[model samples]
Structure formats: structure tokens, C-alpha cells
Target: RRFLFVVFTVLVLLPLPIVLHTKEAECAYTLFVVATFWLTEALPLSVTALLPSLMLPMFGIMPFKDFHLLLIGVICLATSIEKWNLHKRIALKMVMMVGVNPAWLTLGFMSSTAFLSMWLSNTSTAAMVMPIAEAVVQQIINAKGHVTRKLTCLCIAYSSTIGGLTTITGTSTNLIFAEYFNTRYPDCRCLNFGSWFTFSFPAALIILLLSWIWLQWLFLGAEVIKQEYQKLGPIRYQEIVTLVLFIIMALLWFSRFSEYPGFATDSTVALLIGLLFFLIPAKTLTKFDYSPLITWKEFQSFMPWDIAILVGGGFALADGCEESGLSKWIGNKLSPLGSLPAWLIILISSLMVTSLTEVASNPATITLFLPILSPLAEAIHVNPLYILIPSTLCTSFAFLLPVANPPNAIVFSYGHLKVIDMVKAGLGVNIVGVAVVMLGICTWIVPMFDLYTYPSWAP
Candidate 1:
């Protein structure tokens, strides 16, 4: 039904933009086609995204930046975290710490997955840590407990998406928000890892708790009863090396190591530590046989090439919009929104992204929307971040289906869950997510980012 609707959309309304017959004409038409395909499930988003790479340069259009290097470095770090079993040890310890009851065990698994995901990619962590969580549920079945394995799967996987909101490097969209903001308005250097955490973590934490509470209620109920016990006796030399290096990298990033211009950005620190993961040896060899903590093949296999390219396509589209000046045109068009109340505007933007995200990938949802919204801030005389930040966070709120988020799919892939199961639980998180985000936008987000006053750069 919808795909047919876009037929006339293309035949009739699509031609409407070309009346301008300028660069914006081609740009607006390009955008309309992509948006139609993206939302309608007419094509793979990545496949639809392939259009911008050729179209932008074909249009002789603008500059773009790649933040995928951060993920590159972080992927290597995560690879070692996997090999050394540090991630496994951490997962076990958390469950044991909260082992008194099944409900606490649910919280236990979520806290582990959530925190690990805050540092690592949700896809990697979900694939890795989620199994361990499922294992705990296995032990529960053995102990004759009535714990539903599906509930724990939901706990670990769903929270993976939630955790991404807690830190700057937690997800791809956060990195996009950083680069996209600086690219558009260089003078407003307002968002950094430290500042992103300050403004974002609270909203993220509230959602995390809300997710935990809802899942526990829906599945575990008020019934108290569980933690999977594991034996990772004695932390080894390898774990120590990865831990020290991980701590070092985070502190450097937290310091906002931007004093050296391009030389000292967050990715630099990540690569430095990631490199050390290979340079530093795990154990002293008794003879000539020696190897680094992580191997080249391990890094090669773990690299997320598909998503890296997918996000690359988004940057291309954003650059295309800028080169054709369509973003400026979009801002002017959306300027009518300035008349809408702030809370209502935020509600509109957040709900749109959240609902769209239920079918689309989180990073792709924000990537597609942020460029369009960036101009709206300048035209309406408000901080672009006020809208941009909420939109980015909302993307992570995607919890409705396997396609909505990677972590969601990881759990589903285990074959233990039904589609209805995810949909039912998803509505709970989605409804609460809408409310929690709106609350944050109206209250703390206004003050922390100074969003209400509108920055001087808004002009």
C-alpha cells in the first residue's frame, strides 16, 4: 500500500521540488527518494544508502568526515577483552554479586550487559555477553527454578541498546552527532565526551532503570528468587594489561585531549590503546614462542565492515545536503516549527525518531534525520543540539523488533523467543522511553546544554 503511494509521490510531488531548477532541486529530489525507500521498507537501508556516495560526488558536492576509526580502535580493544576473558569474568562477577534472588539476577545480568555495552559495541557485546546471560538461565532450569529464559534474553539484549546512550563512544550515532555538529558549526564546540556524558548519561540512566523495571515486572513479576554462578578464579596477567590500558584510554578521552588540534582527538587515544593490545604480550614465554595479547586475524574477523560502510553512506548524504545547500533550504522550510512550543517540538522530534527506529537501525535513523534537523535549529534561533541530541538519544530507544536494533536481533537469533514476545515487551519500553525522554528534554536538557538561550552560533 505504502510503496504504491510513493509511486504518485515520485510521479507528482517528486517533480515539485525541481521547479527551483537549482542545486537544491536535485538535492531535495535525492532526499525524497531516499526517505521514501528508507521508511517504507522498500529496500535495504544500506542498499538505498548506496545512492548518496555516487549522487553527491556526481553532483560535484561537499566535504565529509569519517569517525569510523574510533569504532575501529574500539573493536580491537573489544577483541582482546574477548580473548582475555576479562569480559566473561566481569559478567560472572556481576551476576554472583546480585545472586540472592531471580529478580536481582535479572538486574544483575542487565547491569553487566549495560555497562559492558557502554564501553563496547552493542552488537559485539550482545553476541558475546548475551550468551553468558543465557547460560545463567540454563543453570536456573537445572536448579528447578521457573525462570523463563526469554526474560533474561530480553534483559541482556534490550539493555544493550539502552547502554549505548550512556557514553559518547557508546554508539555510532553519538559519534555522528559529534562530527555532524562540529562540521556544520565549528564555533560551537559544546559537545565532547565529558560534556556528552554529563548531559546524556542521566537521561540514559533513567531509561536504563525504566527498562529494567518494566522487563522485571512483565516477566519476572514481583517474585523474588537467582544469579548464574561462574568460576573465573584468579585474574591473570592478560586481564591486568587490558584493564590498565582500558582505564588509561578512558581517562585520556575524559580529559578532552583536544589541545593538539587534530592530533589528539578521541580516536587517537583509542588507537593508541588498541595498538598496545597487540604490542603488549599476555604471558612471558619460557622460550622463543611469543605472541601479542590479540592477533591480526582476530581483529580482521571482528571488524564490522558492513556497518562502517553503512554509516559512511550517511556522511555522504549529509555532505550531499550541505553541498547542494539543501540543508539550508530545509531549515528555512522547517522554520515554521519555531512557532510550535518547545516541549511539543521536542515531543514531535523524539517520537518520530523513536517510532522510525522501531523498524530502522539506531545509527541510520539518526544519520538520516540529523542532517535535516541541523538546519532547523539555525533557522529557528535555537541550539541545533536541542533537537539533534534528543533525536540521537531516541534512536537508541528502538526496542520493538529484531530489525529495530542489533542487540534485539542477537537475542532473537538464539531461537528462544517469539515475535509476539518482543513486540509485547517492546511496547512497554517504547511507551516509557517516550515519556522518559520528553521529561528529560523539558527539564535538565534545557539547562545543561543551555538550549533555551540559543547559542551565538545559531545565526
Candidate 2:
């Protein structure tokens, strides 16, 4: 399979430049190679990501900056919470507080996972919360009570992805959009944390509610949620300190560049608070031995440097496409679609991204398409975001297959779910998600971004 894909990549890359302009052809070819590798898994995704640093520079795409500013700092901050086991405490605490009634139990599980995912990685959130979910499921089974195992798994899987839509740092794709937006339109109204939350919070809430209802109607019934539970233990000192630091970080992120321009940025706040985890000693550990919240060894182990490179590669591709005229060339080719009404164009973009993400890397899908869509929107004289933002959000709507996203895969590995079960439940959610995203952009995101007016920075 690997050899075949390698041959296929060469075949595609060789002929492509023959039919197009020099830089445009090279840029397109580089992206094709990268995308192929990402989709095929012929190379490690991280290795595939490094291709851009080589290809883009060689092709004279454009000058690029370090990729660390994208999401690494925020990831480190989120890592602190996970390192201290605060995320677990918060999640278990929620479940215990909500009691063990089956419906509420599911809700509590989904809600805690979702909330945590809005700040942490979706994959990490699933990893943290699934053990508790499995335990709860086991407890119910041991009591000789029946429950919807697939439904429980889907709650953790679906909610994790859904939660990411609520914040920029919540998902890699969100940061991808922000990175491109900042580059493409530096002077536009900045998409700060608060601005993103104002719009996406409501959208996320609606989908979360609809998803909850769909799960209830499809799998859950009166007796499913019914379960008795034990009382939660008193909160630990580590949990308390972790919670306070988390709040401090949230406050810094929320007020970033809004109330204070230079004082607080997302990356700065993340790094500062992340450092606190390494400096502050837990009260309990003082008597026996000293252990800062997280050690250097653990931090090294936890950080996802591969994803940082992947993100940089995406940015590099976008820049290459723009600088080499590949984006404009593709836009002109797609200009006929501009003749269609705005609503149809928006719907088509939403549908294409939503469906394709089921088969492709959500971030790669966004990276591949955004360059084309940005220019296409200009050609069509629609707000670029009308297409871009909706498409970005739709990437997280990959609910159809386990391979579609990591969260899905994580829960599927729990041995309680089947592909068909995911397909059946996800199909409805996918369709509805596209519609809701469209509605959100047209009704709210449009006005918020002033997407109707052409931005000065758009190429």
C-alpha cells in the first residue's frame, strides 16, 4: 500500500507542472504532495508537515515565521491542568454532583468533556474523561442494569469535537483560521477569544443541545440513565490550586488585547500560567518531598511538537499558494461558481468541507481549501469569511467515521462501539451541523466580521 501510494504521488506530481504556470504549478504540486502524504499515511503526518519548510523555501513561496505562536503555548497551558490531574477532578466532580441518573449522567459526562475540550485538546479531553465514562458504564452493568454503551461512547467522542468549535485555542483548525486571518487581514477586527466565544458559544450550545436530544431519542430511554452513585470525596489541595490557576489563565485569555493591548496575549498568558505550574509547590507535597505541579520531563513528554509543525506546514502552503498566484489561478477556475446565489455557494462550501472531513484531516482539509476559498470569495464578491469561517467550523463536524478525527478513534477503541453505530448517529448530526454553521455565519458571523464588505488585505 505504501509503495503504491508513493508511485501515485510521483505520477501526480510529475505531470501537474506541465499544464500550469511555473510558480503556480510548483506551489500546487507541493501542496498536492503534502496533502497526499497527510491523507495516505504513507509518511508520518509530522514528517509530511516538514515537506513545506523544504518545498516552500525552495520554491520562493514567501518569507515565513516560526509556527510556535499558533497553538503551542496554549497547549502547554492546557497540559498543566492535565498534568496536575485537575481536569480529571473537575470532570469527576461534575458527574458526582449531577448524580447517577442515566440521562443526567450522560449529560454530566458530555458537558464536562465538552467544557474541558474548549480549553484543552479534544484528544486529551477524551483520554481524561473516557476512563470515568467506562467506570460509570461498568458500575451500571455490575448493578444488573442495562445502558446504551454506544450512546455513552458517542457522547464523549462527539462532545469533544463539538466543544472545540467554541474557542480559537480549542482546536488546531480554529488556530489555522486565525493564523490565516491575521496574515490575510491584519487590520480587520481581531478574532480575540471573547469575540470568538460571543459567536461560537451560541452555535456550540445549539448543536450540543440538538445532539443531546438526538442521542436521547435514538438510544436513551427512561431506565437507561437511572443509576445510584457514591458521594464524591472532598476536593484535594492540588485540584484547588490547579483550578485557581486555570481561572487566572482564563481571565488573562478573555481580556487579552481587548482591555489591555500589550499586557495580555493568549500565548503570553498561557506561558506565564504554564510556568506557574512548574514553580508553585503543592501544599501536600511540602512535608514529604517537593514536586512542582508538573516536571520538565513530563512537560517534554506531553507537548505535541508534531502538531506545531503540521500547523506551520499549513500556513506555509497557504502563503505559497497566495505568493505564487496559485490561489488566484484556482479562484479564476472556480469563478463560474460565483454565478450561483450566495446561499447556494455558502451551502456548497459547507457541504463539501463537512463531507470531505469525514475522509481527510480536518486541519489539512482547511489548509487545502482555504487558499482556494479565500480568492474564490473575492471573485464572487462575497465576504471571504462567509465561506471561510463556516468551512473552518465544519471541519470539527467529522462525526461519520472513527478515522475522521482522533476523538472518534479514541472512543471507538473502547471496544463498545461499531462503525455502523457511529455512521447512523453521525449522519443526521453532520447534515444538521452544516445547516447550523451556515445559519450562524449568515446571521451572526457575517455582521460580526463585516464579511459583506471586501477587506483591504484580501488578495
Candidate 3:
């Protein structure tokens, strides 16, 4: 209760009119109060995001970026996959093929969940994957409890998270990063699904494998070779349809069938599949009637509106910071760090966001920082992505707490992981994640993006 008073006092006392003369300071105060509240979570994170909705506008800072349809398409597909039991089928099939060893079983779930989330929403991917994982865990437990629930469940959640990082559609923050990048540098067209995939996929794969082994070592200390798990009914036509549609969508996303991919966009492909999901009949029509692969109710209810609003809040925050000259001020202040070794700079940025996302919302954290970093990059004359890429990816590195990620909460809900278990397990992976991001950016991303040489497009 006393701490609650402190949070309240900070918000109330935060508006020190006498101390804040400059409008930039006012904007900074808005960010300061918002950030502090976000970190402490004195207010609901998304609700706390609203501070900018009113605060920024009354302060004369612009704010608004509509939700990208790309996210809508992806979430729709994620829902349909669940509705048709496609996720369960895929998870089971993959787990079966990968074998029943505790390590192999967990790896199967991790790899499949990661691949699925690359196109589908990670939340649903984690949600659906866990049931199969639970069954597999039960089988292992039936024999001798070969694997701990905390380790296996965390694998699914963390892998879903890692999978999300591999593609722009994998998570909202990546989309947020893309939208933010495009809006700021409208001419570049540099951030695309393919471009994002090229770099993040490698790092995600490495992190996934490394974390897999790390968990196996820590949790296992020590698995039987046979596993028993439920078998789904023979695959339905709808499952086949969902599978085919998904493959086509992914193929389109990975490498569209046409010229350099400028005329059409990733959203166009996603929207196409999503619309098809609505048109394609779920089963043989009777009486000239048809039911779609997914219901409007499912899409409407299952889609993450809170995330959309949270995204809007970040977009607004971006505007306020830029319009009020706060981004430039803060960017300039941070520009001095540009002199340090670029690798060190990115590592620090990654570490900060990874730490923040463990407690704060990942999308919100990325939104809050991207606006500042864009200008900071320009002011320093480094490629905008050199810092931006790792920092945003760091948001997904949150594995430290139930509060860190939705999937973490999803796994936590099943009652397997305690806060202490998460902390001890999440600690190493978080450190590894940042380090890998740092290394990847320097070696892989820099050369790939030609980040070493500043591009004229950045301005």
C-alpha cells in the first residue's frame, strides 16, 4: 500500500510545472512518468500506455498510427489453425517424428511452435502447443517423470517467442518496428518480410538450439527412449486446406513469385490467405449452406485488441516524442555513445530492452524505444538498424518472468513454473539472447544490411 502511494505520488508530483519550463522537458516528463509506471507496473501496462493518449495531445505532440492489416491477417490465420485443430495435429506430428526422448520431444515442440508462430500469432501458437506438450509430459511422467513440467513448458513458450522473432509477422513488435521504420523513412522500403527473415531466422535458430541444450542440461541434470501420447483422428479436409493455405502464404512471404517484390507487399499475401480462410468451406456444405474455416466470432474475440491499442499508444508516443523535439534532444544526448565500439553499444541496448521486457510488455517496450533510437541513429550517422534491430529483437528475449511474455503467462497458467523457476532458468537464456543479438548484428546483420557503410536513404 505504501508503495502504491509512491507510484501515485510520482504520477501526481511528476507534473512539476515550476521544474519543467521547456516543452521537451514536458515531453520527457511524460515519458519519464510513463516509463517509471511501466517498469513498476503501478498501472495496467496497456492502461498505462494511455498516459500518452491524453498527455501527449494536450501537450501538442501528434500521435496516431492505425493498426496494420498485416497483423490482422496473421492473427486471423492463427485463429483458424486452432479452430480446425491444425495446430494440435501439427504439434503431434512433429513431436512424434522428432521421437519421444524428453530432449527430442521438447525440441520437436520448440521447433514446430517456432515455425508455426513465424506465421501465426505466437500467443495462440504457445496456447495450442502446450496441450500436446502437456500430454507428452504426462507420458514421460507416467513412466518416471523423466522431465520436469517447468522445463518442458518453458521450452514451448520460449521457442514460440524465438519463432516470433524470425519474421515480421511473427509478433507485433516486429510489425511495430517495420511500421515505425517505414513511417520514419518512407522511401527506403528496406524493412520487408524477407529482409527480416534473413537475419532473425538464423539468430532465432541458434538461440532456440542453444536454449534447448541449456535447458536440457540444467533441468535434466538427466529421458527414456519411448513416449506415449494421444492420437488425433484422421486428418480432415479442412486440416489439409488450412495446411495448404498456410504453406502458400509462407512461400509467398518467404519469396514472392514476382519481381523484386516492390509492387505487392507481405500484407497483401497474408490478407489473401486470411480472406480465403473465410471463403473456404470448413466441411462439405449441406443444403447449399457453407461454414468457413474460422468463424467471425473466433477472429473477433481471439484477436488481440489490447495489443492493437497498445500499439496505437506507442505510435502516439513516437509522434509526441518527435513533434515535441524530444526525440532529437534525447537522440542527441545519446549520440555520444556512438563513439564507443558499435558492438558494445548494441549489447547495452539489447540488455536494457531484454531486462525491461522481462517485466514490461514487449510491444510497448519496443514502441517506447524505437522512436528515440531512430533519431539517435541518424544523429550518430550509423545505419538506423544497427541499433534498432537488436534493441527491438531484445524485447522477445524476455524469459525471466511470467510477466515477461504472453506465452510465459500461458505456460505459467498451466501451473508448472514458479517465479523462482522462471528466474533461474530465464536468467541464462536472457544473457545468451542479448549476447547472440550483439554478435549477430555485428557479424551477420551489418554485412547483410551493409550497415558498416551509412546509407543515404536513412536521411
Candidate 4:
């Protein structure tokens, strides 16, 4: 354990300076670009982050002060709603639903996560859902002593990871890709609200369904087929209210056809929606302890510093990619492929990069890829976002190993799994996940928007 921890710390930190200083700033600049990306991606945001401040003078990474301010803002923005405590309300809703129907509980839990991840961090999504999942498992155990809490934990862990993969804003990796898009590949913008969900939601839904089936097969065993769905007492008022608020939020977020988008696009909307709790009839605004929602100590207690640090470092690394001129240089080199076709690049790039993320930090991996690939897409005369955005967002599907994703580790800790067991199950799902992503990109997303090439020529 100690050795793994040390290796994890060192490897995650070792690539810092290399990402800032390229071995060759002249001609081809591929090595330099790759090196700079490694440095930016490897270090903790607090450590090698001054490059934009100092390197801007030499390496042209960014206007250093501007970079520093952005970093600070990101960290604080991430923490701002620390007071909202929507997780508390989300948990209450889960318990109320579990009391109503166990069969639809997974669906409700998974869907809430899918929707929540559109704005919240995946780690936050997982942390919020896991406790509630455990509660539901305890209920099952009370009724049927045969069902294991361990298996229920597994479902929660996988659900969190799966839900976050569906939208660019669903995971911090998405935000990192967005930032990289704006600075590194000016032509290719980050995904908008609908475009992101349009491409990723169908794929995410497929994964969610498969996960439900797989988990039942793996855990419930032969009894899985015999297990009957049951209905509990009437749905509680709290449950109804929570579900209603959630639906309202979803409609506001996903509403199309109205040319004027609602307040949904603004990041502040997440904050505002959470603030609705103050007006909620079930909780404090109606007469309860508001302390949990507003307490500083409570806010600090649940903050996932590991993920926060990871995201901050990811942004810094992306800045390094821009400063090194790595992406633009790669764009020029790949210029010959301009006529090949957009779907080809989209398929290859999205699959390969997402596969690589299984071995590294997803946010960091996307940061490295976005700079180079976004430009490559543009150089090929395709929509820059066509390949870059989906590829970056898909990295969240790294569901196999403990080191690959925190949620996987969280569930693995329950002791029902072997690494080999996880690898086998995850690999099958991973293939399906990738296939679904491709289908969305080809059949629905690209054709609907006319964003990139799919090909009339070949199968």
C-alpha cells in the first residue's frame, strides 16, 4: 500500500517542468510539445503552476498573473456551493424513494447522478450517492437477509462513474477540455449544453442499462431471475417535492426549441438551484437545522481535496500545452490528413485517448490531448470540437481499475472484488461503452448537426 501510494504521488508529480520547457521549440516541435504536456500534467497544481506566471516571460505559457487568477478562481468556484449541501437533500430523496420501490431505486439513483453530474463533480456525485445507496442496501438486507450490502456498494460506485461520462460539464475533465479549447484551439469551442448531452447521453444510457444487468448478474446470482420487484408505501411528500424540483431543473437545462435559453447555461444556476433549499417546504426553510447546509466545518469535511488538486493541476498542464506551441505544431504536422474525413479522426482519437485515460488521470489526459487534437481537427478542415470534445469527455468511462478512477476504488474497498474480477467485467462494459460513443457520434450527433464527416463511401 505504501509503495503504491509513493509511486502514485511521484508519477502524478514528476511531469511538471517537462510540460513547460520543450526539448525543441523549433521545427516539428513534437518532442517539445509532448514534454511540456507531460510536465503540466504530472505535477500538483500548487507546485509547478507558477510557470504561467514565470514562464510567460520566457516560454509564453500565458499571461502569468492571468493564469494564476484563473487557477484561484477555479478552486474557489469549485468550493463556492460548499454551503448548499444539496447532497443532503439528494440523500433524503433517495431514502424516500427506496421506501417506495426497490426496483426503480437504481433507476432513480442512476438518473439523478446522470443529471447531477451535468454540473457537479463526479467525485462529489459519487460521494453524495454512495451513502444513500448503502441505506437502500440496508433496507434490502432487513427484508431479505440474502442480499449483500457489498454488492449494493458496487452498484453505487459504478453508477457514479457511468453517469459522469454523459456531458462535458458532467465532469471536471470536461471543464479542463473546455478551457483547453478556448485557449489552445481557438477555432474549436467547447461543447454547449445540448450538443454535449446529445452526443454523450445515449451512450451513457446504454452503459447505465448494461451496468444494471451486469451488477444483477454478478451479485444476485441465480436468485436474480427469481427476485421480484416490490412496491413499498406511498411515496413521501419529501420524495415528491425533491423529484419535482429535479425535473424542473432538468427541463430548464435541456429545453430546446425555445431560441432563448433559460438561466440554465450560467454556472451560477447550480448555485441558485441549490439555494432553492432555503425555500423548500421539506427542509430548513420550512423549519429544520440549516446548519448542515451553511456550516463551514461541514463544508470542509466533505470536500474531496484529491480531486480538486487533480483538476487544478490539469488546468495548469493545459496552459503548458498552449505555451509550448505543442498543439499548433501537431496541427501543422497532421495537415496532410485534412481530406481523410472527420468521423475517422473522431473514432480513432476518441477511442485511443479514452483508452489511455484508463492508465492515467482522466482530467490530465484530456488536457494533454485537447491541445494537440483540437488543432488537428481544425487542420483537417473538420469542426475542431468534433473530435476533441467528445474524446476528452469520454475519458470518464475509465471504469476498470482502482487507480484508473476513484469511484472504482471506493467500491473495490468493500472487499467483494479482485482486480482480475473487475478487469474482466469492466473490459466487456468498456467495449460496449466505446461502441455506444461511436454510434452517438456517427448516427445521431454528426449527421444531425452536419458538424463533421461520417462517410458515404465505406462501412
Best prediction by TM-score: 3
What's the lDDT for candidate 4? 0.55
lDDT on C-alpha atoms for all candidate structures: 0.73, 0.75, 0.75, 0.55
Which candidate, 1 or 3, would have the higher TM-score against the true structure?
A: 3
Clashing pairs in 2: 101-225, 102-225, 102-226, 103-225
Least lDDT summed over 10 consecutive residues: which range in candidate 4?
222-231
Clashing pairs in 4: 15-39, 16-39, 19-36, 19-39, 52-64
Model 2, 153: alpha-carbon shift in Å? 0.7
Per-residue alpha-carbon lDDT of model 2 for 1-459, expressed as tens digits?
A: 657866876676676665355777777788777888877666777778788888788777766322244355565567667766777667866776775565777788889988989888899898878877887777667651333778888989899989988888788788777777776676666577678888999898888888988887887661322232223345668778778877787776666454665645555666667677778876546655887777777767866666557667777777777778876766666656767987787777778888888988877778677776776787777777677778888878999978888998998887677788899999888877877887887688877778778777665
lDDT tens digits, residue span 314-356, model 1: 6677677777787676566655667876667777888888888
* Ranking of all candidate structures by their TM-score, best first: 3, 2, 1, 4
* Candidate 4 ranges with C-alpha deviation above 4 Å: 1-42, 52-119, 135-150, 182-190, 218-249, 256-341, 453-459
Model 3 misplacement above 4 A:
1-25, 42-47, 57-69, 100-102, 144-147, 221-231, 258-264, 284-288, 304-312, 318-338, 414-416
The residue ranges of model 1 lying beyond 4 angstroms of the native Cα positions read: 1-29, 36-50, 56-73, 144-147, 222-234, 251-272, 284-289, 295-297, 300-335
TM-score against native, each model: 0.81, 0.84, 0.85, 0.67
